[PDB]
Design an enzyme around this catalytic site. Structure first.
Site, PDB file in Angstrom:
ATOM      1  N   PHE A  11       0.832  -1.192   0.000  1.00 41.40           N
ATOM      2  CA  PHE A  11       0.000   0.000   0.000  1.00 41.40           C
ATOM      3  C   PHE A  11       0.871   1.248   0.000  1.00 41.40           C
ATOM      4  O   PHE A  11       1.729   1.406   0.870  1.00 41.40           O
ATOM      5  CB  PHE A  11      -0.972   0.018   1.186  1.00 41.40           C
ATOM      6  CG  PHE A  11      -1.891   1.196   1.148  1.00 41.40           C
ATOM      7  CD1 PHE A  11      -2.977   1.200   0.276  1.00 41.40           C
ATOM      8  CD2 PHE A  11      -1.653   2.311   1.945  1.00 41.40           C
ATOM      9  CE1 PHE A  11      -3.819   2.296   0.200  1.00 41.40           C
ATOM     10  CE2 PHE A  11      -2.496   3.417   1.860  1.00 41.40           C
ATOM     11  CZ  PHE A  11      -3.571   3.403   0.985  1.00 41.40           C
ATOM     12  N   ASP A  70       9.172   3.010   1.498  1.00 45.95           N
ATOM     13  CA  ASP A  70       7.975   3.700   1.967  1.00 45.95           C
ATOM     14  C   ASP A  70       7.866   3.390   3.458  1.00 45.95           C
ATOM     15  O   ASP A  70       7.509   2.270   3.845  1.00 45.95           O
ATOM     16  CB  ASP A  70       6.763   3.191   1.187  1.00 45.95           C
ATOM     17  CG  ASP A  70       5.450   3.733   1.714  1.00 45.95           C
ATOM     18  OD1 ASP A  70       5.437   4.352   2.807  1.00 45.95           O
ATOM     19  OD2 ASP A  70       4.406   3.538   1.051  1.00 45.95           O
ATOM     20  N   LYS A  98       2.286  10.234   8.616  1.00 46.61           N
ATOM     21  CA  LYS A  98       1.559   9.635   9.767  1.00 46.61           C
ATOM     22  C   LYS A  98       2.183  10.087  11.100  1.00 46.61           C
ATOM     23  O   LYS A  98       1.979  11.228  11.509  1.00 46.61           O
ATOM     24  CB  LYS A  98       1.467   8.093   9.668  1.00 46.61           C
ATOM     25  CG  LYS A  98       0.575   7.547   8.553  1.00 46.61           C
ATOM     26  CD  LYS A  98       0.398   6.042   8.719  1.00 46.61           C
ATOM     27  CE  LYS A  98      -0.615   5.460   7.734  1.00 46.61           C
ATOM     28  NZ  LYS A  98      -2.044   5.782   8.045  1.00 46.61           N
TER      29      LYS A  98
HETATM   30  C1  LIG Z   1       2.819   2.408   3.635  1.00 43.24           C
HETATM   31  C2  LIG Z   1       1.884   3.550   3.340  1.00 43.24           C
HETATM   32  N1  LIG Z   1       2.233   4.364   2.336  1.00 43.24           N
HETATM   33  C3  LIG Z   1       1.471   5.408   1.992  1.00 43.24           C
HETATM   34  C4  LIG Z   1       0.304   5.684   2.677  1.00 43.24           C
HETATM   35  C5  LIG Z   1      -0.523   6.881   2.262  1.00 43.24           C
HETATM   36  O1  LIG Z   1      -0.309   7.919   3.224  1.00 43.24           O
HETATM   37  P1  LIG Z   1      -1.439   9.029   3.526  1.00 43.24           P
HETATM   38  O2  LIG Z   1      -1.766   9.647   2.197  1.00 43.24           O
HETATM   39  O3  LIG Z   1      -0.703   9.908   4.530  1.00 43.24           O
HETATM   40  O4  LIG Z   1      -2.582   8.271   4.159  1.00 43.24           O
HETATM   41  C6  LIG Z   1      -0.080   4.873   3.739  1.00 43.24           C
HETATM   42  C7  LIG Z   1      -1.347   5.196   4.459  1.00 43.24           C
HETATM   43  N2  LIG Z   1      -2.135   4.297   5.053  1.00 43.24           N
HETATM   44  O5  LIG Z   1      -3.261   4.723   5.655  1.00 43.24           O
HETATM   45  C8  LIG Z   1      -4.407   3.868   5.750  1.00 43.24           C
HETATM   46  C9  LIG Z   1      -4.981   4.062   4.472  1.00 43.24           C
HETATM   47  C10 LIG Z   1      -5.849   5.278   4.207  1.00 43.24           C
HETATM   48  N3  LIG Z   1      -6.963   5.166   5.204  1.00 43.24           N
HETATM   49  C11 LIG Z   1      -6.265   5.399   2.749  1.00 43.24           C
HETATM   50  O6  LIG Z   1      -6.791   4.429   2.172  1.00 43.24           O
HETATM   51  O7  LIG Z   1      -6.096   6.491   2.164  1.00 43.24           O
HETATM   52  C12 LIG Z   1       0.724   3.787   4.080  1.00 43.24           C
HETATM   53  O8  LIG Z   1       0.362   2.975   5.089  1.00 43.24           O
END
Ligand SMILES: Cc1ncc(COP(=O)(O)O)c(/C=N/OCC[C@H](N)C(=O)O)c1O
Ligand SMILES: Cc1ncc(COP(=O)(O)O)c(/C=N/OCC[C@H](N)C(=O)O)c1O
Ligand code: NA
Ligand code: NA
Lengths: 383, 378
Positions: free
Chosen positions: A124, A209, A238
């Protein structure tokens, strides 16, 4: 199926690792808004940074720098491999910048044809079209028209598969050192070192990441430090802002020169992230993350002894994954909802895995109380 | 730039040496209520003591309240909140694509956009953006995006077809020389979108939230889009953005989705001030004050071919003699103590606080006259 709170669970107030909803129901927060509130809710140091900078200056455009951004950049540069830092608002934006930078660096330094990005199944990386296409869940990237091309996915932890697809036309390997959403799966040491060696061999950039696993989450400031494998580009968000939207892309002068030491950064965001950084990057907090992990794990083991629900407990630091046994396959959402009924907020990492990402400074009393509540929820689910 | 801002109050900014500047730039049309506006500071501090963050699993009271305000005030029935204009545009463009995919055909993918458009710097948004220089060099771009000239309705008609999912347009192109859509162009886009079952997407990141003297530019024009994006002024300096649409369209993805509690509390306070008869009236009063100064500067120094824009988005296009030299006036401006913008190398741009005090308009424009004088005295 996505998880959404019903109309009767609207958070209104948080303090430390406790959250209250509109009906005044109190919850222990082991979720951290998905690993965001790394110092809990309304931490006094972060509130103070917010309020003081809030009286002074909130915003500069990217044309200017500001003192909070400069101070945060210096902190990150001094503490990590980075020589240059770009600040944005979200992990998605930081990843966009990282991926664009790897592409552009390859374009200008080697060849406009050196475009392949290798990424991993179940990764992700965000929800923008480019980041979701680098992400490894086709269900999330289908249905938006033509995806940005030249992205190849192989299984996480499969070094042979990476070797097989990599070549001189490869610009980047993009990896989460621990796949948070993807079942809390940690890279093995040989896999991650292998990625570094293959990137060196093919003159490709290794992109970590660390949006979820960075800023203290694993018990080191960044996961790369635990592994002792240095990437070319690293992203953070985050926990970086402790609940304030802010993100960073860290790299070297050599790479950043393809596009002072810092660029961008909202003054308010950077003041808050500076306060967060100052607390997380301490021996006491980093050691405590390890102590606290074991308190959680011991509770999860006790729950498993009583109820026989887990096949594996994993993750690193205060990113904890607990995989459900086959008899409970697909039930992660049900344990999550039962948890909420019992007054404890938890996460999933796919339908088979429970996930915990509490404040890095969660009080021992909250660990015990929240895990007692979670045990009660487990009892209701499996009775 | 050659200085570091440390403090702002209203439309005045101080650097590390305590030099005082007048801010006619607003951090590029972001600080729409100026710096450290007491109402915004109060909202920040009060929510900052209460709850900052929820994940997208939850809603929160500030997001619900802001969603209600935007829904009641606009064509919208549904609001998705993000952090930035880029993110809001990503969501809008993905939604237009996905709606076409699931409601019409997976082959209905063409997006029509305009030369000189700016929609953000993500790979997808910069590819929808109309400046090839900024989208080149990042590897394969998301396909099925066609660019035609801004304000060329014939060109849109020519390229549109049943395989078209969206027309994406800034009602006023801010970065692209402060060029406003003509009424027949914008109405034409609405009619063509209707004919081809495509969604009309207005990027109001820069021209929205009062910038034009209406709450949104679409209200000035009387042309209702299918999807609208907002950011910048929405948070007055706090990163927040919104994608506004109907229930019919949003269902391809209650009434709100996402929204940082702190961001939404600040944006709620911002919305409450901007969406007042008095502030919106003042935007027009103040525009004329700016324009009168630009006219006087041109009368004295002969540097502009055109003064344009809407409300407190002002463009002043340089004469051919000064073409390419917008940066020179910007820098001379900074030396004289006034912060201005460019909109390409040929155009000066102004995007001050919507509540900029008249005294600051006069002082800043006097400083700008001095800067122009220095540049022309050679
Ligand atoms: C490994 C990793 N990389 C990038 C992102 C995206 O970051 P964000 O735009 O700060 O949420 C995330 C964000 N995860 O957040 C949960 C998901 C969120 N609720 C969504 O679907 O946008 C991450 O875990
Ligand atoms: C019409 C329009 N649409 C989208 C955006 C992107 O918004 P952002 O991500 O909030 O900066 C913008 C942002 N413009 O910002 C000025 C330039 C920018 N800072 C850059 O260099 O990327 C806009 O004007
Ligand atoms: Na360093
Ligand atoms: Na409405």
């Amino acid at each position: 199926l996505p998880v959404y709170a019903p109309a009767d669970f609207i958070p209104v107030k948080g303090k430390g690792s406790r959250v209250w909803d509109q009906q005044g129901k109190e919850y222990i927060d082991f979720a951290g808004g998905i690993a965001v509130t790394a110092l809990g809710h309304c931490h006094p140091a972060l509130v103070e940074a917010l309020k003081s900078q809030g009286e002074t200056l909130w915003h500069t455009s990217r044309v200017f720098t500001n003192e909070p951004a400069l101070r945060l950049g210096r902190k990150l540069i001094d503490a990590t491999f980075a020589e240059r830092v770009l600040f944005m608002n979200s992990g998605t934006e930081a990843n966009e910048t990282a991926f664009k930078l790897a592409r552009h660096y390859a374009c200008v330094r080697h060849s406009p044809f050196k475009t392949k990005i290798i990424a991993f199944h179940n990764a992700f990386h965000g929800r923008s079209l480019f980041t979701v296409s680098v992400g490894g869940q086709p269900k999330y990237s289908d249905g938006f028209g033509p995806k940005p091309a030249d992205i190849i996915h192989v299984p996480f932890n499969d070094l042979h598969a990476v070797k097989a697809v990599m070549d001189d036309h490869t610009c980047a390997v993009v990896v989460e050192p621990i796949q948070g959403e993807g079942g809390v799966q940690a890279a093995t040491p040989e896999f991650l070192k292998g990625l570094r060696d293959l990137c060196d061999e093919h003159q490709a950039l290794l992109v970590f990441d660390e949006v979820q696993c960075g800023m203290g989450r694993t018990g080191d400031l960044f996961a790369y430090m635990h592994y002792g494998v240095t990437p070319d580009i690293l992203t953070s968000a985050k926990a970086l802002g402790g609940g304030f939207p802010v993100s960073a892309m860290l790299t070297t002068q050599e790479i950043a020169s393809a596009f002072g030491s810092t660029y961008g950064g909202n003054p308010l965001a950077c003041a808050v992230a500076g306060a967060t950084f100052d607390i997380i990057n301490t021996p006491e907090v980093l050691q405590g993350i390890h102590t606290k992990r074991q308190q959680f794990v011991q509770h999860l083991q006790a729950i498993d002894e009583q109820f026989d629900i887990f096949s594996d407990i994993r993750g690193m630091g205060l990113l904890i994954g607990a995989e459900l046994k086959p008899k409970y396959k697909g039930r992660a959402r049900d344990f999550l909802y039962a948890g909420a009924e019992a007054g404890v907020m938890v996460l999933n990492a796919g339908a088979d895995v429970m996930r915990f990402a509490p404040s890095l400074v969660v009080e021992e009393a909250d660990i015990h109380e929240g895990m007692q509540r979670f045990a009660q929820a487990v009892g209701k689910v499996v009775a």
